[PDB]
Scaffold this active site. Sequence first.
Site, PDB file in Angstrom:
ATOM      1  CB  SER A  50      -0.854   0.173   0.636  1.00 43.68           C
ATOM      2  OG  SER A  50      -2.124  -1.584   0.599  1.00 43.68           O
ATOM      3  CD  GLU A  65      -1.906   2.922  -6.843  1.00 42.01           C
ATOM      4  OE1 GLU A  65      -2.061   4.731  -7.759  1.00 42.01           O
ATOM      5  OE2 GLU A  65      -2.136   2.654  -6.382  1.00 42.01           O
ATOM      6  CG  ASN A  74      -3.469   3.988  -0.095  1.00 44.74           C
ATOM      7  OD1 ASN A  74      -4.422   3.773   0.349  1.00 44.74           O
ATOM      8  ND2 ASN A  74      -2.808   2.854  -0.423  1.00 44.74           N
ATOM      9  CG  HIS A 131      -1.868  -1.446  -5.026  1.00 46.35           C
ATOM     10  ND1 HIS A 131      -2.246   0.325  -4.677  1.00 46.35           N
ATOM     11  CD2 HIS A 131      -1.525  -1.876  -3.445  1.00 46.35           C
ATOM     12  CE1 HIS A 131      -2.705   0.680  -3.498  1.00 46.35           C
ATOM     13  NE2 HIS A 131      -2.196  -1.084  -2.565  1.00 46.35           N
TER      14      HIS A 131
HETATM   15  N1  LIG Z   1      -6.122  -4.807   3.076  1.00 48.54           N
HETATM   16  C1  LIG Z   1      -6.406  -4.516   2.086  1.00 48.54           C
HETATM   17  O1  LIG Z   1      -7.635  -4.312   2.467  1.00 48.54           O
HETATM   18  C2  LIG Z   1      -5.077  -3.805   1.204  1.00 48.54           C
HETATM   19  C3  LIG Z   1      -5.256  -3.285  -0.073  1.00 48.54           C
HETATM   20  C4  LIG Z   1      -4.111  -3.448  -0.789  1.00 48.54           C
HETATM   21  C5  LIG Z   1      -3.081  -3.568  -0.180  1.00 48.54           C
HETATM   22  N2  LIG Z   1      -3.167  -4.446   0.532  1.00 48.54           N
HETATM   23  C6  LIG Z   1      -1.159  -4.605   0.700  1.00 48.54           C
HETATM   24  O2  LIG Z   1      -0.993  -6.438   1.151  1.00 48.54           O
HETATM   25  C7  LIG Z   1      -0.344  -6.754   1.389  1.00 48.54           C
HETATM   26  C8  LIG Z   1      -1.048  -7.839   2.742  1.00 48.54           C
HETATM   27  O3  LIG Z   1      -2.263  -7.483   3.096  1.00 48.54           O
HETATM   28  P1  LIG Z   1      -3.038  -8.034   3.933  1.00 48.54           P
HETATM   29  O4  LIG Z   1      -4.270  -7.092   4.253  1.00 48.54           O
HETATM   30  O5  LIG Z   1      -3.382  -9.598   2.314  1.00 48.54           O
HETATM   31  O6  LIG Z   1      -2.789  -8.894   5.354  1.00 48.54           O
HETATM   32  P2  LIG Z   1      -3.259  -9.991   5.772  1.00 48.54           P
HETATM   33  O7  LIG Z   1      -2.511 -10.138   7.109  1.00 48.54           O
HETATM   34  O8  LIG Z   1      -4.360 -10.114   5.279  1.00 48.54           O
HETATM   35  O9  LIG Z   1      -1.693 -10.852   5.099  1.00 48.54           O
HETATM   36  C9  LIG Z   1      -0.708 -11.317   5.363  1.00 48.54           C
HETATM   37  C10 LIG Z   1      -0.577 -12.333   5.082  1.00 48.54           C
HETATM   38  O10 LIG Z   1       1.169 -13.201   4.567  1.00 48.54           O
HETATM   39  C11 LIG Z   1       1.819 -13.960   6.097  1.00 48.54           C
HETATM   40  N3  LIG Z   1       2.815 -13.355   6.392  1.00 48.54           N
HETATM   41  C12 LIG Z   1       3.851 -12.697   6.984  1.00 48.54           C
HETATM   42  N4  LIG Z   1       5.059 -12.675   7.162  1.00 48.54           N
HETATM   43  C13 LIG Z   1       5.197 -13.574   5.964  1.00 48.54           C
HETATM   44  C14 LIG Z   1       6.613 -13.413   5.287  1.00 48.54           C
HETATM   45  N5  LIG Z   1       7.312 -13.906   6.010  1.00 48.54           N
HETATM   46  N6  LIG Z   1       6.376 -14.998   4.266  1.00 48.54           N
HETATM   47  C15 LIG Z   1       4.947 -15.625   4.512  1.00 48.54           C
HETATM   48  N7  LIG Z   1       3.777 -15.188   4.626  1.00 48.54           N
HETATM   49  C16 LIG Z   1       4.269 -13.991   5.552  1.00 48.54           C
HETATM   50  C17 LIG Z   1       0.423 -13.659   7.023  1.00 48.54           C
HETATM   51  O11 LIG Z   1       0.367 -14.840   7.220  1.00 48.54           O
HETATM   52  C18 LIG Z   1      -0.543 -13.292   6.199  1.00 48.54           C
HETATM   53  O12 LIG Z   1      -1.127 -15.006   5.935  1.00 48.54           O
HETATM   54  C19 LIG Z   1       0.208  -5.566   2.506  1.00 48.54           C
HETATM   55  O13 LIG Z   1       1.695  -4.514   2.328  1.00 48.54           O
HETATM   56  C20 LIG Z   1      -0.543  -4.438   2.759  1.00 48.54           C
HETATM   57  O14 LIG Z   1      -0.512  -3.669   2.874  1.00 48.54           O
HETATM   58  C21 LIG Z   1      -3.625  -4.625   1.179  1.00 48.54           C
END
Ligand SMILES: NC(=O)c1ccc[n+]([C@@H]2O[C@H](COP(=O)([O-])OP(=O)(O)OC[C@H]3O[C@@H](n4cnc5c(N)ncnc54)[C@H](O)[C@@H]3O)[C@@H](O)[C@H]2O)c1
Lengths: 288, 289, 288, 289, 289, 288
Positions: free
Chosen positions: A118, A151, A189, A139
């Site tokens: 993000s 994105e 963002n 993204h």
């Molecule tokens: N949730 C949103 O709306 C959103 C939107 C766009 C982008 N993002 C970005 O996407 C990324 C993921 O967000 P999310 O909401 O899916 O998070 P989440 O917590 O739902 O998922 C994160 C996952 O990564 C795993 N993980 C953590 N450390 C790890 C590692 N070292 N190796 C492998 N797996 C690992 C965790 O166990 C978990 O399954 C972030 O960078 C976030 O900023 C989030």
Amino acid sequence: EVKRIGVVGAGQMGSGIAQVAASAGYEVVLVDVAESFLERGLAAIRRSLGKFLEKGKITQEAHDEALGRIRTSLSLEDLKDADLIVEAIVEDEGEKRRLFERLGALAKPEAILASNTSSIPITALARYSGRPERFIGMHFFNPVPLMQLVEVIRGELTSEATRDVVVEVARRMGKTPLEVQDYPGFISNRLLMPMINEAIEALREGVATKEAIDGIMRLGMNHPMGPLELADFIGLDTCLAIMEVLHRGFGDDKYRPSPLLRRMVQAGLLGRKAGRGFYTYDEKGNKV
Amino acid sequence: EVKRIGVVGAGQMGSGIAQVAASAGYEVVLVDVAESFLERGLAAIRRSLGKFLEKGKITQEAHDEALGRIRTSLSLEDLKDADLIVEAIVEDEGEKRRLFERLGALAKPEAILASNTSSIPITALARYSGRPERFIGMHFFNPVPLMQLVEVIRGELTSEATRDVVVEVARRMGKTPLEVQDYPGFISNRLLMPMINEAIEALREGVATKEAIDGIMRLGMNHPMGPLELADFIGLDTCLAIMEVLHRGFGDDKYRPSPLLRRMVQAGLLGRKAGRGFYTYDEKGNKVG
Amino acid sequence: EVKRIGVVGAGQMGSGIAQVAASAGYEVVLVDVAESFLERGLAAIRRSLGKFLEKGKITQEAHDEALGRIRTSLSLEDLKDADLIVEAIVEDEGEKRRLFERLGALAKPEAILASNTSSIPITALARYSGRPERFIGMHFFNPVPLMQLVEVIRGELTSEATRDVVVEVARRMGKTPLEVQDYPGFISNRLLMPMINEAIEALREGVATKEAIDGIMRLGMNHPMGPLELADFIGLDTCLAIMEVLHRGFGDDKYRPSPLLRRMVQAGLLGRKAGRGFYTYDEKGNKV
Amino acid sequence: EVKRIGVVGAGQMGSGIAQVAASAGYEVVLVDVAESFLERGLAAIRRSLGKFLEKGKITQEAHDEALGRIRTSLSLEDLKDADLIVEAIVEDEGEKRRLFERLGALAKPEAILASNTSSIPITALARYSGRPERFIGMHFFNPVPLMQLVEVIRGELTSEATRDVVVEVARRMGKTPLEVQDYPGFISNRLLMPMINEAIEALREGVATKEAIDGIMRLGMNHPMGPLELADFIGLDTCLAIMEVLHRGFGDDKYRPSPLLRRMVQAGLLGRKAGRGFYTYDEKGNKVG
Amino acid sequence: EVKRIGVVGAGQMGSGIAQVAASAGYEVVLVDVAESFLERGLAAIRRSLGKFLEKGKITQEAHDEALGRIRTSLSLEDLKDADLIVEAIVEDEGEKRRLFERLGALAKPEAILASNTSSIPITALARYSGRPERFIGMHFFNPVPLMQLVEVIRGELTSEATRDVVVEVARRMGKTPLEVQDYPGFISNRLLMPMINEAIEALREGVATKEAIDGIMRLGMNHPMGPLELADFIGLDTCLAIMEVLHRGFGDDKYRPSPLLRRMVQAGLLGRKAGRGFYTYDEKGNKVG
Amino acid sequence: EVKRIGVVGAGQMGSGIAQVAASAGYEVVLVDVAESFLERGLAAIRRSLGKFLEKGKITQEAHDEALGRIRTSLSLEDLKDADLIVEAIVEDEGEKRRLFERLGALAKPEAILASNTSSIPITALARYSGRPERFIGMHFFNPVPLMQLVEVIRGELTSEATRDVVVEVARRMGKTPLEVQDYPGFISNRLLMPMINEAIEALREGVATKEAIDGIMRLGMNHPMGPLELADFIGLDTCLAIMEVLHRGFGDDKYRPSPLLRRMVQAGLLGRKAGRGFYTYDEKGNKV
Ligand SMILES: NC(=O)c1ccc[n+]([C@@H]2O[C@H](COP(=O)([O-])OP(=O)(O)OC[C@H]3O[C@@H](n4cnc5c(N)ncnc54)[C@H](O)[C@@H]3O)[C@@H](O)[C@H]2O)c1
Ligand SMILES: NC(=O)c1ccc[n+]([C@@H]2O[C@H](COP(=O)([O-])OP(=O)(O)OC[C@H]3O[C@@H](n4cnc5c(N)ncnc54)[C@H](O)[C@@H]3O)[C@@H](O)[C@H]2O)c1
Ligand SMILES: NC(=O)c1ccc[n+]([C@@H]2O[C@H](COP(=O)([O-])OP(=O)(O)OC[C@H]3O[C@@H](n4cnc5c(N)ncnc54)[C@H](O)[C@@H]3O)[C@@H](O)[C@H]2O)c1
Ligand SMILES: NC(=O)c1ccc[n+]([C@@H]2O[C@H](COP(=O)([O-])OP(=O)(O)OC[C@H]3O[C@@H](n4cnc5c(N)ncnc54)[C@H](O)[C@@H]3O)[C@@H](O)[C@H]2O)c1
Ligand SMILES: NC(=O)c1ccc[n+]([C@@H]2O[C@H](COP(=O)([O-])OP(=O)(O)OC[C@H]3O[C@@H](n4cnc5c(N)ncnc54)[C@H](O)[C@@H]3O)[C@@H](O)[C@H]2O)c1
Ligand SMILES: NC(=O)c1ccc[n+]([C@@H]2O[C@H](COP(=O)([O-])OP(=O)(O)OC[C@H]3O[C@@H](n4cnc5c(N)ncnc54)[C@H](O)[C@@H]3O)[C@@H](O)[C@H]2O)c1
């Protein structure tokens, strides 16, 4: 050339990215750090593909073939022959750095590495990867199977070839890829979060109630959610982290977080995920 | 109570305010400075009420009775017995000041005066009216017959009673009145315009094309219009004037207008109304090229 | 604890299960794949409850309250908060597998999943569900509103608690639950179908006519229906599929289908539902 | 006398005939050659009765009772005690001949046999039936539940009694039966199809565009559809087959098919059902310009 | 460019054409051969405009201004400065020829001449006019004030410019102009009249009664009138004359008039206007018996 | 204060009253004695709202929301919380008496009870209700969705408050309420029915044919229907019952029913609904 896609992180975003890649006809390897997380991920994929099948948007065949193209793993080594690896792990620069140093070492030389981050600079993650010309921001928008946008974020060193490959993958996923430069907040963002932050400042200043602020933006501007209920949905900790990236990255007070946003996060009033932010939520989410 | 409503300005907003007041059962006097402007105004009202009738949203009776409750005039003196007078004239503090000094002198003592201003401080207009306790912002959204929102803006001295009367009028008009304090940009413009301004800064900095910026906000954030096409729709002159009100009123650089927004306005690239802003428009106001 | 029951399949069996659940005082959500099938299902429920009302088995109140407790839906997600979900879809392992993977993903963790399957191993369906300790066979008899029996089938991993809950639901439905282990044919089909199969073999061998065979079993053994007319009633395709499950599951030639049963099915002489099996039927399903 | 009605063919027309017979209070046996076709037929009947229920044209009871009066079968023998059997199978004289020879042999002596044929001579089908005095054309209009007309077609040997029974059945179905002699095109196709054919000839001769031709007939003559869009709706293969029946049956060049109609059919440009005839259609059957 | 419109013939069609021209804002000169015919014509115009006013389709002003734009005359010389002259006199080629030779001589050089003829070749009338490039068919539908269609008929020599002017006049009259080539029956009569003729032949052959024929076309094909009642409405003399034009113009037996149509016309059974055709009419023109 | 309206009788009038109440924004409970009668009633409501929608008089939303505000029931107890209950059952004093005694016992104390009766004295029904100050005549015109008039009839004891509430409900229904005192025939029937009765007497006396009588009143007096065709439309049984109420209520021979009206009713020649009265009607109710 792109046949095999790796996804690291079977969370909210990574399980959606894995699904849309599989539905597009790519072989997918989905990696996480524990079996329970992979199970939670495939459960989300079955629920989403199940709804597409139920409402006649896909065939039984396409449903079953998509699931058939997804393999789960606890081992990064299983990404050794992926053409594209999309990282969707925790929003923490240190964690992404350690992951991208490992992926740079084990991925085959022609593999492109991409981040769903993000807020973390694409150019920094590109340096950690050791292959910046083959690094890009990809993204996606929550929830991935329903949101048409990708994105696509060029790092300083991202090659034309890398951009062309990732733009084509997005199109095969049924998405509209729109290209942006690597500057704080990208476009999405940078435009969204300062308006949420301004709503929080107006609330702190007593300009209007939370209901009046959200109602004005819903009814007046036709936003589907008002900024305060949207902040609760995103998570106030996430909102604060994005405002801090804008503030530190531009180095400009213009982007200072609302002191009320800081205070809410200090209180642990993080929004829907904590049962309370600006609004109070029941166990199903829904306001009370 | 309120039986008789005055509307000053038969433009885009005033003709809509007159229509919704008439449809709600109020007697309406609509005032402007020339007969041609009054005719253009009631033409817009007939087209809108015509569509409501055609789609079964109102009956023939209600259609005809609504038009029957609207009288036009070139004379402010015809507002002498209005219970509520809503000003919707040009966005110019001097013009509104001269109007409100006249309305304060001629309106009956119990009459409430209201402004549809986008940006001028309600507290200042209240002082010009001579009856600040009976002054309030009543900020409608374009187009008035279709937009449910009224932003109701309390001046420093606006009475509880004045707010209660105007909130009830808005409800009888079928609107949702949402109350806000008199500070620069109120809520609507304070939240919207800095995001449009930021899109223009991202465009100036080369972060993305106008298509990529508008597409990201439409597809990613489910905004019906992206900020650059929305700026073109509002008018870049209006966008710049609102950013200047935020910048001067808060006194904070945070709200500085994009230099590209200033440059576009200097060039007269004002958006749809000039045939060109960020995008190019044909005679009908659709994008071309 | 069990307040809300989901039923998947508004066919011959599912519409009966939904009816007896509703008459017992449970809130019911009945799910199928098209509105026409749901309408056909609640029409069968109205006809049956109508007959119960006419013959003084229930009051107008109980009739109307039972119908009032049934909601139909095209969305499986409407079973998210069901305490018990009973599957009564097509007898096809692939279809049931895809359903149970989806139900395991969307149902709340404490929800018990049950199959009305005639023949498919409960232990296999339990594995597909992802919650085998909370999986059980709940095998009703056609027509469900009239038949007192429930055959309750424990999978290898079915918990004591799961069995206790489903046995109590059956009792509240006015049924007699009798417990059996998950082995091919359970008890009901293991005992019935080889005798039908033997009648078909005796017919093929010319030992007696169909009339002599059915008459001997009706008059001599006091069976309400002889095995050949019963095969026609069940469907010869269903009879063959059950004999194949016994043959493949025991791996024992003892349970080999009659070659005449195979031949009849190849010819599409499937019994009452095709207008012809061992006997010939009119459009109302009476012999001619 | 008529309690039990057989319908042979669970297609577009037969499933409608079965529905209107059942809604009228007759016991119906609907026959086809495969279970899938019977299922498709009762699906069409449930959709139509469902719409009648939704619009308040029938009650839940009448809906359920109508469906309760329809039994499906793969066996013609199940029509042994039908009072009236209406054939609505494929428009092929050989297939109808083989059906009517079988029905003549198995139906009880007092049973009337009827054909829904568009174009095959009633008198010929009557001969194949072996009971020509008890044979008649009962020509319904698509879609049967919505179209009030039945064209009742007397064969050379059709008795007064046979006509009286079928006219009464049509009336109990809520239809208006109108009687015609067995000659090529009856009335309906004899009057309609030569005008469609003439529009196709005018188009081939360059007299006007398809839009001008259809617009002239819609606006000038108040036809709901112009002849070229109507040809596309009917199917150009059906239009050609009906013109051939008029041409061969009258033996008169007056009824010669347009060479452009022949060419369109040779190209497989059959209209809505092929995605293209005179106009081009999307998957929903709407024109695309 | 078109400000002044001449109409020759103050009959059923000409009085309608004059009215729609006047209502569109054109200055109109309406010409006939006797004062009684002009009086009958403006009586029809007052009745029609009167109904539009009563029903609120037009204002008092528009009503009075439309009548104010119509002058009547017995002198063709009063058309000397008309931009467009529309002929709507008796359907007789000799009469139209003599009129168009006179109009060609007296009309200013840039004036367009147009015929409302049902059946006479536009190309022939164009030659009689002496200005064929400035000649066109402008075929209105009865009654003109109510019927949106104009069939615009290009003669062999009709210029693009002539077509553009007449298409624009039709649009200003609130009509939909649809373009056709000058061949027998144009589109309207070529498509309509052979179907009416076929209904008459089916009636003569005893295929069905008049009620069965008209009922089948109303209920089955959704025609507002069946062909036999429509023939009575048009006049059987007019139906026969149009079939004769198709028969002689194509030179093809395909278009031969029904012998029953010829016999009805010989008997003076002309339809509504004679009190009897296929049906019998009272003095108000409703069916009786 | 009036939010919930009860309607008893899902007939010609009750189904119209339910519809106009629902279209006005009131929650409606429609009660009858059998499911078939409720089904016939909501079929009439769907047909009427359907025609309003088709001809553009209402929106899809208003159509759907109006139907959504109507619940049917076989239980009078479901009217326990109605603010206003309008009776539109059979025109029989004994039946209305038994209904109003029950409604008086079960309706909440502040509930107003109203009768749509054509002819039965409001003051008598008010006494049967046990709450005469909260009883009133609310007399609608057939068909209710199309007819603007409500004749509001004060019983001897009807309160000002009761009248004010019912006048306001009529106005919210888009109707014009006109007030009348409780005397035989009110105004509507007292004025109309003796003129119809006189036309029948003139016909019996041979003064003119039915066509001459109806033509004279249509053409001479601009009545949309002549009195004999109108009698056929109302029903000759209804015409006779109203004349009997005028005759017995005033006790004055002035209002004696025509002997020809009595004879027609004895013959069952009841008008449109029987296919024959003064004129003969086809199945669609057009003269033949
Ligand atoms: N949730 C949103 O709306 C959103 C939107 C766009 C982008 N993002 C970005 O996407 C990324 C993921 O967000 P999310 O909401 O899916 O998070 P989440 O917590 O739902 O998922 C994160 C996952 O990564 C795993 N993980 C953590 N450390 C790890 C590692 N070292 N190796 C492998 N797996 C690992 C965790 O166990 C978990 O399954 C972030 O960078 C976030 O900023 C989030
Ligand atoms: N956010 C926005 O989009 C925005 C921006 C600026 C202002 N506004 C507000 O909207 C309202 C009018 O805007 P609009 O788009 O309807 O404009 P408009 O120009 O279409 O209409 C304004 C009308 O006021 C009339 N007028 C001017 N001076 C007058 C006077 N002294 N007395 C009477 N009539 C007079 C004009 O002739 C014209 O008919 C004002 O209250 C203005 O403050 C809108
Ligand atoms: N019919 C019997 O006598 C009998 C006896 C006991 C057990 N059973 C078992 O009960 C089950 C159902 O049998 P039935 O006779 O009711 O079959 P049926 O064909 O009457 O009904 C099956 C229903 O399931 C629906 N369906 C299919 N896939 C679905 C899905 N994914 N989600 C929701 N609905 C779906 C179909 O549309 C249909 O309505 C089978 O497993 C069968 O072996 C049948
Ligand atoms: N569709 C129209 O608009 C229309 C209009 C009027 C008349 N017709 C006539 O009605 C008849 C049926 O047309 P349709 O459009 O319903 O066709 P369809 O193809 O939709 O239906 C024909 C049905 O007949 C069945 N069938 C074929 N041969 C059979 C046989 N030997 N025995 C039993 N069933 C058999 C097929 O399985 C199919 O279900 C034709 O004669 C056609 O000319 C059609
Ligand atoms: N009536 C229709 O429905 C209809 C349809 C379309 C086209 N047309 C055509 O329009 C024309 C007019 O038909 P109509 O129905 O109006 O006829 P009409 O008889 O009602 O009117 C004809 C008028 O022309 C006048 N007239 C005759 N000779 C004249 C002359 N030499 N100079 C000037 N005026 C003369 C007559 O006095 C009369 O007033 C015909 O060519 C007819 O075919 C008629
Ligand atoms: N029909 C008219 O034109 C008209 C005019 C105005 C007033 N009214 C009056 O309105 C009333 C209704 O007449 P209608 O034409 O609607 O009659 P209807 O026969 O059409 O409807 C009466 C309904 O009441 C039901 N019913 C009978 N007893 C009941 C009970 N105890 N509880 C509940 N429902 C019961 C019946 O089942 C039936 O559905 C009568 O008093 C009549 O005099 C009729």
